[PDB]
């Protein structure tokens, strides 16, 4: 289920502070009559490959972007004439090199030591350590091996089809049913492969869009429900550092409308973490206003404030253990969003340890407690790698 539609960008702006070395974007997108969404839904984005990486390919093959050509034997337009540059928007250009890809290159290689090296990469250990660990691509190996006689049409056909990227919708449909926002951390750094500068495909595509540009996307609803309790007095604990705040911005906007409609709201704790308020404290103004209107209680942790200890949300949670565990005993829902590889597990461990300490039980009893909480639908994750 990818029921995709084309539509316009209504806003696009930077969320980090002037002089941050990093970027996080906020985009507002319009939705057509047929689409609709709910808090905790995702936007599926079909991205385009950026100019830099398209030019690296046409340069390697000595081709002009506009050169029309036709293929025949990825989801490629076959038996149609189509330029090179548009063919190149159908495929992934920076996935690790596959074993099929390596064999194809080896077979077209006429410098013998270079063939020995490409074949070396097929072995189990080398493949794990030099290809997969560093995310070494076919493109980077073609640039390294200019006398590999592979040709464009064989290149294009060996590549995977371009995949969508998911973003947690950061707005509530209770404010505007036909407009949705996303919050996009921009992937950028030195390539782990060693070949220059790395840019994440969808995130840099999204970062470069402007008001009036079009975008192809669809609404996706996750198998794991990530929604507010049915009763607005049921207490919430939300942990969402960095771009993890995204779905909680939707939660905040929802609660704010429910209040404006006379509903009473219970406690809602938002644990937010970032480097610094001088840098990446996304939506600070909105979140401080929300807190002032009693929509949330806000707890921050800063990793890089001069003259302060490095603080993460789990450290703050641990200080607040007693209170957070009493809340969960009264029927609170707990939510985590953001980084699933390090932050989520550590937050989970701190929650269980708070339980163990408060209720004087074993770690096994604390683990069973969390298991039961999840099975009741009260412990939800919107995390990613
Ligand atoms: C359910 C879900 C919800 C999500 N919600 C959000 C969200 O709300 N906001 C958000 O910003 N993202 C979100 N993501 C992540 C998002 O979908 C994209 O994966 C992310 O934006 C990166 O995709 P990309 O195309 O820009 O980069 P890609 O081109 O796909 O590259 C991604 C890969 O590059 C790797 N990489 C990173 N740095 C380097 C480097 N220097 N050298 C080599 N490789 C590197 C990454 O580890 C990753 O493996 C979500 C993901 C999921 C699954």
From Swiss-Prot:
Domain spans labelled FAD-binding FR-type: 2-229
Coiled coil stretches, renumbered: none
Leader sequence segment: none
Taxonomy, superkingdom: Bacteria
Region (NADPH--P450 reductase): 1-385
Subcellular locations according to the entry: Cytoplasm
Biotechnology comment: This protein is a target of protein engineering. Its selectivity-directing and activity-enhancing mutations have been extensively studied and the designed mutations allow this enzyme to act on non-native substrates and/or in order to enhance production of synthetically desirable end-products.
Induction: By pentobarbital. Expression is negatively regulated by repressor bm3R1 at the transcriptional level.
Disulfide bond sites: none
Family: In the N-terminal section; belongs to the cytochrome P450 family.
Function: Functions as a fatty acid monooxygenase. Catalyzes hydroxylation of fatty acids at omega-1, omega-2 and omega-3 positions. Shows activity toward medium and long-chain fatty acids, with optimum chain lengths of 12, 14 and 16 carbons (lauric, myristic, and palmitic acids). Able to metabolize some of these primary metabolites to secondary and tertiary products. Marginal activity towards short chain lengths of 8-10 carbons. Hydroxylates highly branched fatty acids, which play an essential role in membrane fluidity regulation.
Record's protein name: Bifunctional cytochrome P450/NADPH--P450 reductase
Residues of the full protein shown: 659 to 1048 of 1049
């Amino acid at each position: 289920m990818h029921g995709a539609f084309s539509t316009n960008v209504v806003a696009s702006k930077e969320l980090q502070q002037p002089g941050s070395a990093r970027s996080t974007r906020h985009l507002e997108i319009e939705l057509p009559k047929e689409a609709s969404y709910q808090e905790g839904d995702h936007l599926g984005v079909i991205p385009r490959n950026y100019e830099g990486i398209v030019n690296r390919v046409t340069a390697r093959f000595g081709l002009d972007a506009s050169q029309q050509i036709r293929l025949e034997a990825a989801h490629l337009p076959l038996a149609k004439t189509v330029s090179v540059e548009e063919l190149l928007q159908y495929v992934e250009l920076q996935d690790p090199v596959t074993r099929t890809q390596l064999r194809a290159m080896a077979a077209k290689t006429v410098a013998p030591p270079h063939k020995v090296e490409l074949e070396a990469l097929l072995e189990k250990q080398a493949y794990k350590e030099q290809v997969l660990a560093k995310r070494l691509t076919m493109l980077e190996l073609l640039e390294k091996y200019p006398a590999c006689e592979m040709k464009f049409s064989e290149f294009i056909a060996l590549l995977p089809s371009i995949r969508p990227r998911y973003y947690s919708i950061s707005s509530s449909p209770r404010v505007d049913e036909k407009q949705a926002s996303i919050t996009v951390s921009v992937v950028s750094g030195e390539a782990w492969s060693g070949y220059g500068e790395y840019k994440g495909i969808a995130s840099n595509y999204l970062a470069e869009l402007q008001e009036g540009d079009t975008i192809t996307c669809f609404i996706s609803t996750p198998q794991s429900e990530f929604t507010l309790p049915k009763d607005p007095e049921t207490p919430l604990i939300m942990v969402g550092p960095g771009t993890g705040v995204a779905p909680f911005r939707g939660f905040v906007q929802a609660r704010k409308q429910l209040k404006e409609q006379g509903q009473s709201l219970g406690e809602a704790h938002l644990y937010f973490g970032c480097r610094s308020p001088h840098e990446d404290y996304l939506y600070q103004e909105e979140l401080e206003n929300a807190q002032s209107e009693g929509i949330i209680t806000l707890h921050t942790a800063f990793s890089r404030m001069p003259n302060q200890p490095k603080t993460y949300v789990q450290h703050v949670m641990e200080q607040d253990g007693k209170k957070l565990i009493e809340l969960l005993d009264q029927g609170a829902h707990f939510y985590i969003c953001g980084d699933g590889s390090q932050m989520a597990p550590a937050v989970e461990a701190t929650l269980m340890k708070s339980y163990a300490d408060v209720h004087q039980v074993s770690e096994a009893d604390a683990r069973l407690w969390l298991q039961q909480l999840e099975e009741k639908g009260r412990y939800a994750k919107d995390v990613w790698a």
